[PDB]
Symmetry: D2
């Protein structure tokens, strides 16, 4: 239902944040 | 410089994630 | 059930992470 | 040096949040 869709959208948002953090950490290290 | 720009992009990514969490919490509470 | 409790624990984890980000941002600015 | 320490504390907070998200996702799947 609607909550299952909301969970999928949140899980995608978590992945987008994890990519941003990985890019940030590389910039700090690099 | 590059690191300052990387920090700005990371800060924007954090805002986008915080909005996704808010939307997720609203969907759970609704 | 268990999921409702897991949501409460995750919400607490989010608040802790949001407070860590706030401290990090102040350290970047300061 | 103080910013370097703040980065380390933020990196630990990110790991703590990633562990919470993993536990939350397991509870949703279970």
């Amino acid at each position: 239902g609607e909550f299952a869709q909301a969970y999928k959208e949140f899980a995608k948002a978590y992945k987008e944040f994890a990519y941003a953090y990985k890019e940030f950490a590389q910039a700090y290290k690099g």
